[PDB]
Amino acid sequence: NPLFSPYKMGKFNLSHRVVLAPMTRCRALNNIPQAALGEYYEQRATAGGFLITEGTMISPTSAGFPHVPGIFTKEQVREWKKIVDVVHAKGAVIFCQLWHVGRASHEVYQPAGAAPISSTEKPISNRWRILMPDGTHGIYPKPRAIGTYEISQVVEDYRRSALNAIEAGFDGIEIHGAHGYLIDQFLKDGINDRTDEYGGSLANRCKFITQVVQAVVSAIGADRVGVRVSPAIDHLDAMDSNPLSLGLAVVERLNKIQLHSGSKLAYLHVTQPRYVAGSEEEEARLMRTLRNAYQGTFICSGGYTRELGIEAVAQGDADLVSYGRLFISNPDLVMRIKLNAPLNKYNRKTFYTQDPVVGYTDYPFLQ
Ligand SMILES: Cc1cc2nc3c(=O)[nH]c(=O)nc-3n(C[C@H](O)[C@H](O)[C@H](O)COP(=O)(O)O)c2cc1C
Numbered sequence: 061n062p063l064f065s066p067y068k069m070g071k072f073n074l075s076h077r078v079v080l081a082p083m084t085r086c087r088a089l090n091n092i093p094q095a096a097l098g099e100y101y102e103q104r105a106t107a108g109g110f111l112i113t114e115g116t117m118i119s120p121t122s123a124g125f126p127h128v129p130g131i132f133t134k135e136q137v138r139e140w141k142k143i144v145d146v147v148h149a150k151g152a153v154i155f156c157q158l159w160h161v162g163r164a165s166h167e168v169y170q171p172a173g174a175a176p177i178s179s180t181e182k183p184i185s186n187r188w189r190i191l192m193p194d195g196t197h198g199i200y201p202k203p204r205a206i207g208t209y210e211i212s213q214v215v216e217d218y219r220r221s222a223l224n225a226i227e228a229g230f231d232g233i234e235i236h237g238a239h240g241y242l243i244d245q246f247l248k249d250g251i252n253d254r255t256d257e258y259g260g261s262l263a264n265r266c267k268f269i270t271q272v273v274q275a276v277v278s279a280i281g282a283d284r285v286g287v288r289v290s291p292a293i294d295h296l297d298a299m300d301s302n303p304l305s306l307g308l309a310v311v312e313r314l315n316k317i318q319l320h321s322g323s324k325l326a327y328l329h330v331t332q333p334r335y336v337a338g339s340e341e342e343e344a345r346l347m348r349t350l351r352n353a354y355q356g357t358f359i360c361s362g363g364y365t366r367e368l369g370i371e372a373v374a375q376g377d378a379d380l381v382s383y384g385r386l387f388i389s390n391p392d393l394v395m396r397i398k399l400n401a402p403l404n405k406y407n408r409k410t411f412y413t414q415d416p417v418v419g420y421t422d423y424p425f426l427q
């Protein structure tokens with residue numbers, strides 16, 4: 061089974077290639093990591109396994125979900141430390157995903173009820189609704205398009221958050237540059253309608269992600285930095301006229317950052333276009349084209365099964381395979397995939413609820 065061949069992710073020696081995908085679960089009450097998070101990641105940690113946390117706020121304006129953690133306060137750092145300690149006790153590697161939602165937010169999630177920030181003044185269309193703290197769905201508002209000064213301040217938020225993650229003991233961080241959130245709002249020409257140096261050409265639309273990655277690489281070192289993108293995704297009106305070219309433009313800039321820094325990033329993480337909340341062959345081809353173009357470790361994500369994961373690694377389509385929903389409902393997903401044991405179903409109704417146990421840590425282990 062190729063999923064259990066060891067793999068060297070730069071400075072981290074992994075014993076297998078089953079990765080816990082980053083997953084927002086909304087148990088971090090008032091944006092403070094809670095003890096429930098400690099039990100949840102502990103259940104899923106394995107010796108030599110790689111975990112990526114739920115997306116984590118880099119600033120008070122970053123959030124667009126209720127009770128998601130931050131890592132921009134010392135209190136948050138203090139509580140994350142306890143969670144990282146118990147994961148490390150199991151011998152796992154864990155990265156903190158740094159997450160800014162941009163225009164995918166709401167007045168209720170913003171300080172003083174201010175407008176969410178974005179590359180653009182265009183709101184997400186009414187085809188998408190935002191989950192509210194009371195469990196209803198609200199309207200995405202019109203965002204405020206930020207200037208280049210404010211852009212440089214968001215980059216500094218990323219840099220400070222990456223340092224706080226290292227202070228909490230994280231092995232590294234992942235830049236959430238995917239799924240129509242803030243970075244993807246700069247990347248996608250369906251969203252970025254800017255007329256300054258951050259829009260109007262493919263090179264300009266890649267500026268924001270390049271400067272974010274550069275800042276965090278300089279702060280904590282390239283081999284502690286992973287980057288997630290989804291050039292072809294149907295989420296929150298994040299379309300591009302040429303998804304493969306956008307992906308390859310990002311990859312080229314990551315390659316160049318690596319050469320200038322003298323070290324490879326931890327990995328590039330790409331979401332399969334089939335992942336939803338046009339050809340099957342052209343979608344597998346886009347993934348392999350990006351993998352072949354990038355000088356380093358490739359993590360694929362989105363709709364993988366045990367068989368699809370084995371095949372991705374055996375065929376050289378990816379080095380690591382991250383699992384989301386199946387990891388929600390199978391705390392010992394790694395052992396189950398090793399033994400080819402039956403997997404348990406997941407309940408989407410408790411994906412984003414606040415209960416510290418139900419649908420969170422009460423999915424059982426193999427008997
Ligand atoms: C409940 C839930 C929360 C998620 N939260 C995040 C997130 O915060 N950041 C992110 O990059 N991806 C997030 N994802 C996407 C996953 O990281 C992963 O790519 C996806 O679940 C893989 O597809 P799979 O569930 O079939 O394994 C989330 C997915 C789910 C189902």
Ligand SMILES: COCCOC(=O)/C(=N\O)C(C)=O
Binds near residue numbers: 084295335
């Ligand atoms: C169909 O693609 C959906 C991608 O969006 C996500 O998976 C996500 N965060 O990135 C959350 C919070 O669910």
